[PDB]
């Protein structure tokens, strides 16, 4: 059990196997289990199933290896962590592809109508410190969040802010 982060949303199961060629992935391609959202799309974070305990060190070795044009975070995990995953009531919204220096003030001004819960915007950072380009948003109600989803690609600066219906589980994993 080796948790992965920063993987692309348009990647294949063989791409992570080719990325982790040094390691012998248990249960072939089935072992490289992706973590999906409530919408169904892949999150960007995966759950790799390393066969041997010695291969875990070989897996963790590529902690900041460049998969094309981005850094991939690699971290050790427990089998219990993999079991507790929710993919398939909640007022969460997965925001994706945001301007570089995008502020919480910019995001609140964007959804000027739909109410956000206190400190709703939970904008996460990469291991280096920079913003991931994605964000979260806990609205006051699920019905409020549903309305937010209607603006699924409005321009913020010069970016179609892709909005997806997420959950608290995805927010806790980030």
PDB file of C-alpha atoms in Angstrom:
ATOM      1  CA  UNK A   1       0.000   0.000   0.000  1.00  0.00           C
ATOM      2  CA  UNK A   2       1.723   3.161  -1.354  1.00  0.00           C
ATOM      3  CA  UNK A   3      -0.486   6.317  -1.716  1.00  0.00           C
ATOM      4  CA  UNK A   4       0.230   8.522  -4.781  1.00  0.00           C
ATOM      5  CA  UNK A   5      -0.626  12.250  -5.402  1.00  0.00           C
ATOM      6  CA  UNK A   6      -0.300  14.767  -8.272  1.00  0.00           C
ATOM      7  CA  UNK A   7      -1.136  12.222 -11.043  1.00  0.00           C
ATOM      8  CA  UNK A   8      -3.066  13.513 -14.147  1.00  0.00           C
ATOM      9  CA  UNK A   9      -6.870  13.300 -14.467  1.00  0.00           C
ATOM     10  CA  UNK A  10      -6.410  12.033 -18.053  1.00  0.00           C
ATOM     11  CA  UNK A  11      -3.899   9.215 -17.235  1.00  0.00           C
ATOM     12  CA  UNK A  12      -4.144   5.400 -17.871  1.00  0.00           C
ATOM     13  CA  UNK A  13      -3.607   2.432 -15.491  1.00  0.00           C
ATOM     14  CA  UNK A  14      -0.591   1.323 -17.626  1.00  0.00           C
ATOM     15  CA  UNK A  15       0.995   4.834 -17.313  1.00  0.00           C
ATOM     16  CA  UNK A  16       1.424   4.395 -13.500  1.00  0.00           C
ATOM     17  CA  UNK A  17       2.819   0.863 -14.144  1.00  0.00           C
ATOM     18  CA  UNK A  18       5.318   2.342 -16.701  1.00  0.00           C
ATOM     19  CA  UNK A  19       6.056   5.147 -14.153  1.00  0.00           C
ATOM     20  CA  UNK A  20       6.692   2.500 -11.438  1.00  0.00           C
ATOM     21  CA  UNK A  21       8.653   0.062 -13.742  1.00  0.00           C
ATOM     22  CA  UNK A  22      11.319  -0.565 -11.007  1.00  0.00           C
ATOM     23  CA  UNK A  23       8.570  -2.017  -8.768  1.00  0.00           C
ATOM     24  CA  UNK A  24       6.606  -5.219  -9.436  1.00  0.00           C
ATOM     25  CA  UNK A  25       2.949  -4.103  -8.987  1.00  0.00           C
ATOM     26  CA  UNK A  26       0.828  -6.786  -7.222  1.00  0.00           C
ATOM     27  CA  UNK A  27      -2.372  -7.993  -9.035  1.00  0.00           C
ATOM     28  CA  UNK A  28      -0.987  -6.553 -12.326  1.00  0.00           C
ATOM     29  CA  UNK A  29      -2.849  -3.426 -13.496  1.00  0.00           C
ATOM     30  CA  UNK A  30      -5.800  -4.206 -11.099  1.00  0.00           C
ATOM     31  CA  UNK A  31      -3.471  -3.399  -8.132  1.00  0.00           C
ATOM     32  CA  UNK A  32      -2.960   0.237  -9.284  1.00  0.00           C
ATOM     33  CA  UNK A  33      -6.389   1.310  -7.911  1.00  0.00           C
ATOM     34  CA  UNK A  34      -7.398   4.929  -8.656  1.00  0.00           C
ATOM     35  CA  UNK A  35      -9.312   7.096  -6.134  1.00  0.00           C
ATOM     36  CA  UNK A  36     -12.422   8.537  -7.869  1.00  0.00           C
ATOM     37  CA  UNK A  37     -14.774  11.468  -7.014  1.00  0.00           C
ATOM     38  CA  UNK A  38     -18.603  11.378  -6.425  1.00  0.00           C
ATOM     39  CA  UNK A  39     -18.952  12.610 -10.086  1.00  0.00           C
ATOM     40  CA  UNK A  40     -17.057   9.477 -11.265  1.00  0.00           C
ATOM     41  CA  UNK A  41     -13.936  11.161 -12.793  1.00  0.00           C
ATOM     42  CA  UNK A  42     -10.457  10.214 -11.352  1.00  0.00           C
ATOM     43  CA  UNK A  43      -9.268  12.529  -8.504  1.00  0.00           C
ATOM     44  CA  UNK A  44      -5.551  12.687  -9.408  1.00  0.00           C
ATOM     45  CA  UNK A  45      -4.430  10.603  -6.427  1.00  0.00           C
ATOM     46  CA  UNK A  46      -4.018   6.807  -6.635  1.00  0.00           C
ATOM     47  CA  UNK A  47      -3.500   3.740  -4.388  1.00  0.00           C
ATOM     48  CA  UNK A  48      -0.587   1.585  -5.599  1.00  0.00           C
ATOM     49  CA  UNK A  49      -0.416  -2.057  -4.443  1.00  0.00           C
ATOM     50  CA  UNK A  50       3.297  -2.975  -4.085  1.00  0.00           C
ATOM     51  CA  UNK A  51       3.917  -6.778  -3.912  1.00  0.00           C
ATOM     52  CA  UNK A  52       7.019  -7.020  -1.640  1.00  0.00           C
ATOM     53  CA  UNK A  53       7.943  -5.031   1.530  1.00  0.00           C
ATOM     54  CA  UNK A  54      11.384  -4.306  -0.035  1.00  0.00           C
ATOM     55  CA  UNK A  55       9.668  -2.852  -3.175  1.00  0.00           C
ATOM     56  CA  UNK A  56       7.993  -0.221  -0.869  1.00  0.00           C
ATOM     57  CA  UNK A  57      11.434   1.493  -0.519  1.00  0.00           C
ATOM     58  CA  UNK A  58      11.850   1.276  -4.355  1.00  0.00           C
ATOM     59  CA  UNK A  59       8.320   2.816  -4.725  1.00  0.00           C
ATOM     60  CA  UNK A  60       8.954   5.625  -2.179  1.00  0.00           C
ATOM     61  CA  UNK A  61      12.347   6.270  -3.956  1.00  0.00           C
ATOM     62  CA  UNK A  62      10.540   8.153  -6.808  1.00  0.00           C
ATOM     63  CA  UNK A  63       9.047  10.725  -4.321  1.00  0.00           C
ATOM     64  CA  UNK A  64       9.352  13.682  -6.782  1.00  0.00           C
ATOM     65  CA  UNK A  65       9.773  12.056 -10.227  1.00  0.00           C
ATOM     66  CA  UNK A  66       8.474  14.067 -13.231  1.00  0.00           C
ATOM     67  CA  UNK A  67       5.584  12.271 -14.981  1.00  0.00           C
ATOM     68  CA  UNK A  68       5.665  14.294 -18.196  1.00  0.00           C
ATOM     69  CA  UNK A  69       5.187  17.936 -17.143  1.00  0.00           C
ATOM     70  CA  UNK A  70       4.369  17.648 -13.369  1.00  0.00           C
ATOM     71  CA  UNK A  71       5.701  16.334 -10.021  1.00  0.00           C
ATOM     72  CA  UNK A  72       4.271  13.153  -8.550  1.00  0.00           C
ATOM     73  CA  UNK A  73       4.109  12.767  -4.762  1.00  0.00           C
ATOM     74  CA  UNK A  74       4.852   9.227  -3.459  1.00  0.00           C
ATOM     75  CA  UNK A  75       4.071   8.199   0.169  1.00  0.00           C
ATOM     76  CA  UNK A  76       3.920   4.957   2.240  1.00  0.00           C
ATOM     77  CA  UNK A  77       0.459   3.682   3.305  1.00  0.00           C
ATOM     78  CA  UNK A  78      -1.435   1.018   5.285  1.00  0.00           C
ATOM     79  CA  UNK A  79      -3.892  -1.517   3.782  1.00  0.00           C
ATOM     80  CA  UNK A  80      -6.574  -0.060   6.165  1.00  0.00           C
ATOM     81  CA  UNK A  81      -6.154   3.443   4.589  1.00  0.00           C
ATOM     82  CA  UNK A  82      -6.878   1.915   1.122  1.00  0.00           C
ATOM     83  CA  UNK A  83      -9.997   0.160   2.512  1.00  0.00           C
ATOM     84  CA  UNK A  84     -11.449   3.464   3.831  1.00  0.00           C
ATOM     85  CA  UNK A  85     -12.039   5.270   0.499  1.00  0.00           C
ATOM     86  CA  UNK A  86     -15.284   6.835  -0.821  1.00  0.00           C
ATOM     87  CA  UNK A  87     -15.732   7.056  -4.620  1.00  0.00           C
ATOM     88  CA  UNK A  88     -19.042   5.260  -5.441  1.00  0.00           C
ATOM     89  CA  UNK A  89     -26.234  15.398   1.654  1.00  0.00           C
ATOM     90  CA  UNK A  90     -22.637  16.721   1.073  1.00  0.00           C
ATOM     91  CA  UNK A  91     -22.278  20.361  -0.057  1.00  0.00           C
ATOM     92  CA  UNK A  92     -18.680  20.073  -1.370  1.00  0.00           C
ATOM     93  CA  UNK A  93     -17.459  21.177  -4.832  1.00  0.00           C
ATOM     94  CA  UNK A  94     -14.168  20.121  -6.488  1.00  0.00           C
ATOM     95  CA  UNK A  95     -12.693  23.188  -8.206  1.00  0.00           C
ATOM     96  CA  UNK A  96     -10.059  22.452 -10.857  1.00  0.00           C
ATOM     97  CA  UNK A  97      -7.571  24.418 -13.007  1.00  0.00           C
ATOM     98  CA  UNK A  98      -7.396  27.832 -11.302  1.00  0.00           C
ATOM     99  CA  UNK A  99      -5.207  30.887 -12.117  1.00  0.00           C
ATOM    100  CA  UNK A 100      -1.684  30.802 -10.529  1.00  0.00           C
ATOM    101  CA  UNK A 101      -2.068  33.503  -7.807  1.00  0.00           C
ATOM    102  CA  UNK A 102      -5.789  32.885  -7.312  1.00  0.00           C
ATOM    103  CA  UNK A 103      -7.023  34.211  -3.954  1.00  0.00           C
ATOM    104  CA  UNK A 104      -9.896  33.031  -1.702  1.00  0.00           C
ATOM    105  CA  UNK A 105     -11.266  36.598  -2.185  1.00  0.00           C
ATOM    106  CA  UNK A 106     -11.345  35.968  -6.021  1.00  0.00           C
ATOM    107  CA  UNK A 107     -13.224  32.595  -5.617  1.00  0.00           C
ATOM    108  CA  UNK A 108     -15.846  34.100  -3.189  1.00  0.00           C
ATOM    109  CA  UNK A 109     -16.432  37.060  -5.577  1.00  0.00           C
ATOM    110  CA  UNK A 110     -16.892  34.440  -8.375  1.00  0.00           C
ATOM    111  CA  UNK A 111     -19.783  32.603  -6.618  1.00  0.00           C
ATOM    112  CA  UNK A 112     -21.449  35.948  -5.640  1.00  0.00           C
ATOM    113  CA  UNK A 113     -24.851  34.442  -4.810  1.00  0.00           C
ATOM    114  CA  UNK A 114     -24.279  30.891  -3.564  1.00  0.00           C
ATOM    115  CA  UNK A 115     -23.305  30.962   0.132  1.00  0.00           C
ATOM    116  CA  UNK A 116     -20.067  29.371   1.345  1.00  0.00           C
ATOM    117  CA  UNK A 117     -19.657  27.855   4.837  1.00  0.00           C
ATOM    118  CA  UNK A 118     -17.168  29.690   7.184  1.00  0.00           C
ATOM    119  CA  UNK A 119     -13.660  29.013   5.695  1.00  0.00           C
ATOM    120  CA  UNK A 120     -15.309  26.908   2.924  1.00  0.00           C
ATOM    121  CA  UNK A 121     -12.459  27.445   0.402  1.00  0.00           C
ATOM    122  CA  UNK A 122      -9.825  24.852   1.437  1.00  0.00           C
ATOM    123  CA  UNK A 123      -7.266  25.634  -1.370  1.00  0.00           C
ATOM    124  CA  UNK A 124      -4.404  23.022  -0.983  1.00  0.00           C
ATOM    125  CA  UNK A 125      -0.675  23.349  -1.811  1.00  0.00           C
ATOM    126  CA  UNK A 126       1.914  21.039  -3.477  1.00  0.00           C
ATOM    127  CA  UNK A 127       4.784  19.494  -1.438  1.00  0.00           C
ATOM    128  CA  UNK A 128       7.005  22.469  -2.591  1.00  0.00           C
ATOM    129  CA  UNK A 129       4.518  25.046  -1.210  1.00  0.00           C
ATOM    130  CA  UNK A 130       2.781  26.417  -4.368  1.00  0.00           C
ATOM    131  CA  UNK A 131      -1.044  26.082  -4.958  1.00  0.00           C
ATOM    132  CA  UNK A 132      -2.099  22.788  -6.649  1.00  0.00           C
ATOM    133  CA  UNK A 133      -4.295  24.745  -9.110  1.00  0.00           C
ATOM    134  CA  UNK A 134      -7.307  22.899  -7.669  1.00  0.00           C
ATOM    135  CA  UNK A 135      -9.491  23.916  -4.670  1.00  0.00           C
ATOM    136  CA  UNK A 136     -12.445  22.904  -2.474  1.00  0.00           C
ATOM    137  CA  UNK A 137     -15.694  24.773  -1.488  1.00  0.00           C
ATOM    138  CA  UNK A 138     -18.133  23.669   1.251  1.00  0.00           C
ATOM    139  CA  UNK A 139     -21.401  25.487   0.512  1.00  0.00           C
ATOM    140  CA  UNK A 140     -24.212  26.157   3.075  1.00  0.00           C
ATOM    141  CA  UNK A 141     -26.513  23.475   1.489  1.00  0.00           C
ATOM    142  CA  UNK A 142     -26.360  20.684  -1.133  1.00  0.00           C
ATOM    143  CA  UNK A 143     -29.114  22.469  -3.155  1.00  0.00           C
ATOM    144  CA  UNK A 144     -26.897  25.629  -3.021  1.00  0.00           C
ATOM    145  CA  UNK A 145     -23.911  23.526  -4.269  1.00  0.00           C
ATOM    146  CA  UNK A 146     -26.074  22.016  -7.096  1.00  0.00           C
ATOM    147  CA  UNK A 147     -26.770  25.587  -8.352  1.00  0.00           C
ATOM    148  CA  UNK A 148     -22.981  26.349  -8.161  1.00  0.00           C
ATOM    149  CA  UNK A 149     -22.319  23.392 -10.515  1.00  0.00           C
ATOM    150  CA  UNK A 150     -24.476  25.189 -13.228  1.00  0.00           C
ATOM    151  CA  UNK A 151     -21.477  27.557 -13.827  1.00  0.00           C
ATOM    152  CA  UNK A 152     -19.286  24.516 -14.785  1.00  0.00           C
ATOM    153  CA  UNK A 153     -16.683  26.586 -16.830  1.00  0.00           C
ATOM    154  CA  UNK A 154     -17.016  30.395 -16.320  1.00  0.00           C
ATOM    155  CA  UNK A 155     -13.928  32.609 -17.002  1.00  0.00           C
ATOM    156  CA  UNK A 156     -11.793  33.727 -13.994  1.00  0.00           C
ATOM    157  CA  UNK A 157      -9.051  35.873 -15.525  1.00  0.00           C
ATOM    158  CA  UNK A 158      -8.651  33.547 -18.530  1.00  0.00           C
ATOM    159  CA  UNK A 159      -9.552  30.174 -16.913  1.00  0.00           C
ATOM    160  CA  UNK A 160     -12.691  27.997 -17.268  1.00  0.00           C
ATOM    161  CA  UNK A 161     -13.001  27.022 -13.580  1.00  0.00           C
ATOM    162  CA  UNK A 162     -14.106  23.349 -13.880  1.00  0.00           C
ATOM    163  CA  UNK A 163     -16.527  22.560 -11.008  1.00  0.00           C
ATOM    164  CA  UNK A 164     -17.369  18.967  -9.986  1.00  0.00           C
ATOM    165  CA  UNK A 165     -19.697  17.650  -7.205  1.00  0.00           C
ATOM    166  CA  UNK A 166     -17.270  16.348  -4.494  1.00  0.00           C
ATOM    167  CA  UNK A 167     -17.594  15.077  -0.811  1.00  0.00           C
ATOM    168  CA  UNK A 168     -15.988  15.487   2.686  1.00  0.00           C
ATOM    169  CA  UNK A 169     -13.996  12.254   2.103  1.00  0.00           C
ATOM    170  CA  UNK A 170     -12.187  13.803  -0.916  1.00  0.00           C
ATOM    171  CA  UNK A 171     -11.584  16.998   1.155  1.00  0.00           C
ATOM    172  CA  UNK A 172     -10.037  14.886   4.001  1.00  0.00           C
ATOM    173  CA  UNK A 173      -7.693  13.172   1.433  1.00  0.00           C
ATOM    174  CA  UNK A 174      -6.934  16.331  -0.732  1.00  0.00           C
TER     175      UNK A 174
END
